[PDB]
Write a structure and sequence with these properties.
The complex is a heterodimer.
Chain A lengths: L8
Chain B lengths: L14 E3 L9 E5 L9 H14 L8 E5 L3 H13 L3 E6 L4 H9 L3 E5 L4 H15 L4 E2 L8 H18 L3 E7 L4 H13 L5 E7 L4 H6 L30 E5 L1 H15 L5 H14 L8 E6 L13
Parallel strand pairs in B: 2-10, 3-4, 3-6, 4-5, 7-8, 7-10, 8-9
Antiparallel strand pairs in B: 1-2
The chains are: A little secondary structure, B alpha/beta.
Chain lengths: ~10, ~300
């Protein structure tokens, strides 16, 4: 799960 | 020929025609997993470092510090090792041990921030490290650094033009930092001069581009499509060049990635499934059924062996 630029 | 270090071997990824998506082969995929550290980010890790060297903001003394929990961290890591830079990366505790073992394997100074704090906690700590000795640390800032879309304008875009012989009609690409769709669209529309349809893809769970362009309230959310859905409009997303925004849900993105594996023999990551699902939707509209649709596949499956993909 990813939000606010996480996982990029 | 022979590349002088691994960063120079970025790109020249192949186009592969799909047989169980689209209509009579009008959907083609660009396999960005075939890159030095096996994602599209290899291009921007290389060129952001190159540009900072040509600008002098990065010298032999200086040390790279950035906040990234994804493929850009691996990309900066392999480039920093190939070119002799010390690098520090910050990230939440959230991260898979394999992604951390990979980064330590590449020699990263890993700095771990609070999990509940998330991405903001990581970017906060990185900026403090950079505040310690601004003459010693360089942050490259993938969301804002124009060297990010510029490398797609100079390589990814022209590769698509050349390999399709100018016949590309549509480019479909998930948006993380936005650099891919921005650089590719500028190269094909402005340098080659063909009026294609640029399609941005975002999670339906965090559809901030659709909502912004629609003048609706911007409601970011959590999703499982790693690599896209930042929850904000990045500076490196050139909205003015986007013709269309497609939303995809996490389950469909995941199902489509598994179909790419089992039906096409293509080992694609989950954001690759989202982009193909958006491409299939356009490709089965009569208005696109005769167009050549090029879809970016940002990463490979094995980045995701221990996730919801398998």
């Amino acid at each position: 799960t990813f939000e606010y630029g996480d996982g990029i | 020929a022979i590349y002088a270090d691994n960063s120079y071997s970025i790109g020249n990824t192949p186009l592969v025609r799909l047989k169980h998506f689209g209509h009579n082969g009008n959907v083609v995929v660009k396999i960005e997993g075939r890159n030095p550290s096996y994602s599209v980010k290899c291009r921007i890790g290389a060129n952001m470092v190159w540009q900072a060297e040509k600008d002098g903001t990065l010298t032999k003394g200086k040390e790279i510090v950035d906040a990234t929990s994804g493929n850009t961290g691996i990309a900066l890591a392999y480039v920093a090792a190939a070119r002799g830079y010390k690098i520090t990366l910050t990230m939440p505790e959230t991260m898979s041990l394999e992604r951390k073992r990979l980064l330590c394997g590449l020699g990263v100074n890993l700095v771990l921030t609070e999990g509940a704090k998330g991405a903001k906690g990581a970017i906060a700590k990185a900026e403090e490290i950079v505040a310690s000795d601004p003459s010693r640390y360089v942050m490259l800032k993938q969301f804002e650094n124009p060297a990010n879309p510029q490398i797609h304008r100079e390589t990814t875009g022209p590769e698509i033009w050349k390999d399709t012989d100018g016949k590309v009609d549509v480019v479909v690409a998930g948006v993380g930092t936005g650099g891919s769709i921005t650089g590719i669209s500028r190269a094909i529309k402005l340098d080659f001069g063909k009026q294609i349809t640029s399609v941005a893809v975002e999670p339906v769970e965090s559809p901030v581009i659709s909502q912004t362009l629609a003048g609706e309230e911007v409601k970011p959310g959590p999703h499982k499509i790693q690599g896209i859905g930042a929850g904000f409009i990045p500076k490196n997303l050139d909205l003015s060049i986007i013709d269309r925004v497609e939303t995809v849900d996490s389950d469909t993105a995941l199902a489509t990635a598994r179909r790419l594996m089992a039906e096409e023999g293509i080992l694609a990551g989950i954001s690759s499934g989202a982009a193909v699902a958006a491409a299939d939707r356009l490709a089965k509209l009569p208005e696109f059924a005769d167009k050549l649709i090029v879809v970016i596949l940002p990463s490979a499956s094995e980045r995701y062996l221990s996730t919801a993909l398998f």
